[PDB]
Homo-oligomer: 117 residues x 4
């Protein structure tokens, strides 16, 4: 949406990774992971609309990209259960975050692009 | 060294990532993460001797590489709290699991190299 | 533009890589590299308008991303002279190609996203 | 093994990339690429003994990893012709150069690990 976007690419096919489930959690006061938002990537491999400026407060967030479910639906047995992307957000004020992930059956890469709006 | 090894490289300095704390967890029947093994990477960026064949049974494992503290010790501002690598140990495949992680302040990749002696 | 786009990210700063020079070559009949197109990445780290559907014929192309010039302008001494991305294009008909590159001082990654228009 | 080593991993199969042809060139005074050294990766994905301290003088070097043929031998359709790694050898820094390449059909990364004995 505005504050948090996720974009996933498939390194085997050289294509957007479509229909990839994404779960976002936020660390609570008791140090447990509270469900914060979720969704799926579109045809373009992008997931917009996860949250709002209002809801996306300071905190430690975990973005779980369900890579195994993605590869299995393509008849592939991958190594990882999911990608995890854990980071502190907005601790110097609001930012826009794009979490990019590149997927291969035994590997993935991830990159944060952080903009000041 | 044997069943499980972790190797970490620093993409900013073109070096092994030395003295990086690494924690391994095993998923418990109640879906909590139980501490399993840990250590710090060597001068060569490697962490050997985390577990044994006997101890390393099939199951879901999480490897956390404490990248934020690594970068902070170098006076470099990082994005991630840590790199996570989550996977299922399988007895069908090759016997050796090497988790390799390539670190940048706002990006990391990880690959699993699964081999036989 | 339409047929060939280049997008570059900075893994140290978690930002688009701005003002990155890009040179594209095409292998000639005599197996030498003919200059084909060039440009620079914009504020968004993207380079559009390199070529047209008419000019972008079948062939072997080389996309040179001038990473050393990029890092030097930021006071950094990197390892690589430039990224090279060499590939056969349009050998099964016209496609759209996006060449993505992620830059660190001692490392880079690249990924092709290929669409059928 | 000594001054220059090349190591290659397969991100699709989670293995060393075996029997991969690797060519090293040195830039000549007329900006042509002169063949310098070559070989094929071992069972461990490594290529040692390319050059000697005596032979490996300062200059610009290009390492070409013949990835297209690697993937074709596995019946996997690749994007790149080859992976290129271009850099300047420097006597000021550490004495050992390890070029590591992580391969996917439509993506590759490469990092330089520059160390001392
Ligand atoms: O994830 C990584 O760090 C590797 O690069 N991934 C990129 C990615 C993923 C999804 C959408 C766009 C990208 C992208 C764009 C430019 C450079 C690198 C990347
Ligand atoms: O981390 C990744 O998956 C990217 O590649 N990483 C490699 C790595 C990390 C630590 C130690 C050795 C490596 C390595 C060796 C050859 C090819 C790729 C890689």
């Amino acid at each position: 949406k505005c504050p948090l976007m996720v974009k996933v690419l498939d390194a085997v096919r050289g294509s957007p990774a479509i229909n990839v489930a994404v779960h976002v959690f936020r660390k609570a006061a008791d140090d447990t992971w509270e469900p914060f938002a979720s969704g799926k990537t579109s045809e373009s491999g992008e997931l917009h609309g996860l949250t709002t400026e209002e809801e996306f407060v300071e905190g430690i967030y975990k973005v779980e990209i369900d890579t195994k479910s993605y590869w299995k639906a393509l008849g592939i047995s991958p190594f990882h259960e999911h990608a995890e992307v854990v980071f502190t957000a907005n601790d110097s004020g609001p930012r826009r975050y794009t979490i990019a992930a590149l997927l291969s059956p035994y590997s993935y890469s991830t990159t944060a692009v952080v903009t000041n709006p």
